[PDB]
């Protein structure tokens, strides 16, 4: 390996071999059908709301999030990096397809297939990747960085469609050698979102776009069909020139027979045929390819860059709304753009670079964090994009002020903006892109008091109830198989209108969105005090027995939702405190009076009551009325953990706080398979995981990473990160279960999971608050 020396990886970049296998995978721990695609991953292309194609580590685009929603693991073949080298002096040269596998079928069998083991390394750092290629049959050495502009306070770029390919190519050998790189991609219209004729229609045109010390190459792979439907618009390939290379070109191949009609030219030489044809194809699939050749000699470098754009403008859901998508703000709605797309990515792409880096380097520059946290920290931030993000720009035939968001709880569990996940999941998009954050909060403001008096069947008991309750916070804001931001509350196995933490997680949420965005904001405040007074005010109609605080009905009436609590919970009372607190210094910021005083009040005395009923000199009962009450909860202080965030002081005593995190640690850290695996949930004081439930005795990597930020706040220092490190070492580590971009909710003592895609796993972010 002498290409790393030509680039720049970071050293706390994920790794692996390509075409390495994995021998310890876990898979899914449930009885009922979940997702399970496997551990070929990698980190996600594509903006926020424009739909993500995951390129694995084996070089195949194959994880599909372009379906706004909907997660299809498929590999595309067709689309590849492919490499032809020929040293000077002998008769032939050799191409190989740059993807460690091949074909299912005999489509595409001319190409050159399975890119041998030990010849190249994969490496991420979210948002970039990269791939380096050191193969003893290539004696020129090759590397690719690969990104979306995924920036922080940043809302244009950010939504793109569009990726880049910065290729780096060394020659360390003493004869000249020519090189030739190829990008062949299948026109993908009708991939998803067309019922009949799947192909009909498609063509392919080329592009030369030639000025002063710019020239573009691009392949544009649309339809005939000027229609504006989810599933019409373009992808585009192209490279820009740089000096010492040529581009080559092939309009038209069929991605439904051999290949060899590409293959032939590519191979002999590396340089193609230069063949434009727009002519449609009907029932075939087709592909372009885009390549550029170029002689290195001896310690020569050279540096290219492609990229790919996609501009499918409009996404649909189960329910029959279609949106635009947040990117048409830039680049237009009628689905014939990208080509612009890609233009603007080929001629910006290292100030891009530059930005990314500007946003990375404060942490990575910190050398009193390991690298592994840093490793963990910036390859979580996966979900934000790869979460069946929407992001819209208007409903088609529909001129709002705002875009509204949504970020998928995961693809399992299909329902947008989860709001006693997001409670964890959403600090990266409150410390990062804080416009996003507080827009999903007023979203979420504007259905506290809708009323759906129409009935649904509860999935855990077979009971009718009412969809939505005035003065409750929905569970969600819809499915993507549905109406989402139209139709809340899609979830049904409980009914959250009587859960007795979304009301109070809302109120910390908003804020904390305040408080972390600098105490400014009062005009979000404004807008959201009406409902963070009724969200308390009906909360407070649930306590039964009047000490002041809600009570847990002895069903699974919050986020463990077949976990029971009974009474008052350590958990759903703790979060009640921190919401009056909350509440309080909102009122004295906007001068309510009378609020102040009620909140003050109710405070003080359910405070007083939360400690006696709860309190047993080493940590707070998981609550008062269960059969495994006197069980240890790893998340027992969820509420004191959101007031240290959101610097409400001490809702309870320090020493107690303390005292309660140094048992989590001891106990449901420390006696779960030695403190390697996280946070378990439940524990029976006598050291043995409370058999209860399911939920007791999984991890909740969400959990874990929120309670690791609540020691590093309480000056746990070592426990915060031991903590922590079991999270990362399952999901990144070659002694873990194989989880990287896929970070599950929960894993049991097996390591075996539970809902993979997850977006609790987020919270590692409140490490760095
Ligand atoms: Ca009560």
Redesign the pocket.
């Given at each position: 390996d002498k290409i790393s020396h030509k680039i720049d990886i970071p050293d706390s970049a994920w790794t692996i071999g390509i075409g390495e296998k994995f021998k310890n995978a876990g898979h899914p721990n449930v009885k009922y059908p979940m997702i399970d695609d496997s551990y070929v991953q990698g980190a996600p292309l594509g903006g926020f709301g424009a739909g993500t194609i995951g390129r694995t580590y084996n070089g195949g685009f194959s994880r599909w999030h372009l379906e706004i929603g909907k997660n299809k693991y498929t590999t595309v073949y067709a689309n590849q990096f492919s490499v032809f080298q020929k040293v000077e002096g002998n008769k032939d040269g050799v191409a190989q397809v740059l993807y460690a596998g091949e074909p299912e079928n005999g489509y595409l069998s001319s190409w050159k297939w399975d890119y041998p083991k030990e010849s190249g390394m994969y490496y991420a750092l979210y948002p970039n990747s990269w791939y380096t290629y050191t193969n003893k049959d290539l004696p020129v050495q090759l590397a690719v960085k690969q990104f979306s502009p995924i920036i922080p306070y940043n809302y244009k770029e950010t939504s793109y469609p569009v990726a880049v390919f910065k290729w780096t190519a060394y020659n360390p050998t003493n004869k000249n050698v020519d090189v030739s790189i190829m990008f062949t991609w299948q026109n993908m219209i009708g991939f998803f979102g067309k019922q009949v004729n799947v192909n009909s229609g498609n063509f392919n045109k080329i592009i030369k776009d030639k000025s002063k010390d710019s020239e573009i190459v691009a392949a544009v792979m649309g339809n005939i069909s000027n229609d504006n439907e989810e599933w019409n618009g373009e992808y585009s390939i192209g490279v820009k020139k740089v000096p010492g290379v040529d581009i080559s070109y092939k309009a038209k191949f069929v991605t439904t027979g051999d290949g060899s009609d590409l293959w032939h030219e590519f191979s002999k030489n590396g340089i193609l045929d230069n063949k434009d044809d727009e002519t449609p194809t009907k029932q075939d699939g087709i592909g372009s390819a885009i390549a550029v050749n170029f002689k290195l000699q001896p310690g020569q470098t050279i540096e290219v860059p492609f990229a790919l754009s996609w501009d499918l403008p409009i996404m649909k859901f189960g329910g029959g709304d279609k949106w635009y998508k947040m990117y048409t703000k830039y680049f237009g709605k009628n689905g014939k753009n990208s080509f612009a797309i890609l233009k603007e990515a080929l001629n910006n792409y290292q100030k891009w670079e530059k930005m990314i880096d500007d946003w990375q380097k404060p942490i990575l520059s910190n050398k009193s964090k390991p690298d592994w946290y840093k490793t963990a920290l910036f390859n979580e931030l996966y979900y934000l994009a790869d979460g069946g993000t929407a992001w819209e720009n208007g409903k088609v035939g529909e001129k709002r002020t705002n875009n509204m968001f949504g970020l998928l709880e995961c693809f399992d569990y299909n329902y947008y903006e989860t709001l006693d996940v997001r409670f964890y999941g959403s600090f990266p998009l409150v410390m990062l892109w804080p416009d996003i954050e507080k827009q999903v909060m007023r979203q979420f403001a504007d259905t506290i008091n809708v009323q759906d008096s129409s009935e649904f069947k509860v999935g855990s008991n077979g009971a009718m109830a009412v969809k939505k309750v005035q003065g409750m916070i929905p569970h969600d804001l819809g499915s993507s198989y549905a109406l989402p931001w139209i139709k809340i509350n899609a979830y049904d196995w409980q009914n959250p209108n009587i859960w007795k933490d979304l009301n109070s997680k809302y109120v910390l949420l908003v804020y904390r969105d305040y408080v972390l965005t600098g105490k400014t904001d009062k005009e979000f405040l404004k807008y959201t005090w009406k409902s963070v007074k009724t969200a308390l005010d009906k909360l407070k109609e649930?306590?039964?027995?009047?000490?002041?605080?809600?009570?847990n009905e002895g069903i699974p009436d919050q986020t463990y939702d077949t976990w029971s609590m009974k009474?008052?919970s350590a958990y759903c009372g703790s979060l009640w405190l921190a919401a009056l607190k909350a509440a309080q210094e909102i009122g004295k910021v906007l001068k309510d009076n009378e609020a102040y005083i009620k909140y003050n009040e109710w405070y003080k005395i359910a405070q007083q009551?939360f400690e006696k009923e709860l309190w047993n000199g080493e940590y707070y009962n998981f609550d008062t009325e269960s059969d495994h009450k006197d069980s240890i909860m790893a998340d027992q202080l969820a509420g004191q953990w959101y007031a240290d965030i959101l610097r409400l002081g001490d809702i309870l005593p320090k020493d107690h706080v303390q005292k309660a995190l140094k048992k989590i640690y001891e106990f449901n850290v420390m006696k779960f398979e030695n403190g390697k695996m996280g946070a378990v949930n439940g524990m029976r004081p006598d050291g043995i995981v409370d058999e209860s439930d399911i939920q007791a005795q999984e991890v909740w990597t969400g959990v874990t990473y929120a309670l690791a930020s609540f020691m590093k706040y309480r000056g746990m220092t070592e426990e915060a990160y031991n903590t922590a490190y079991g999270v990362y070492k399952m999901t990144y580590d070659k002694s873990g279960k194989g989880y990287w971009f896929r970070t599950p909710e929960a894993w049991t003592k097996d390591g075996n999971y539970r809902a993979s895609m997850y977006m609790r796993p987020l919270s590692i972010w409140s490490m760095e608050v």
């Open positions: 649930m306590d039964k027995d009047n000490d002041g605080i809600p009570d009474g008052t009551n």
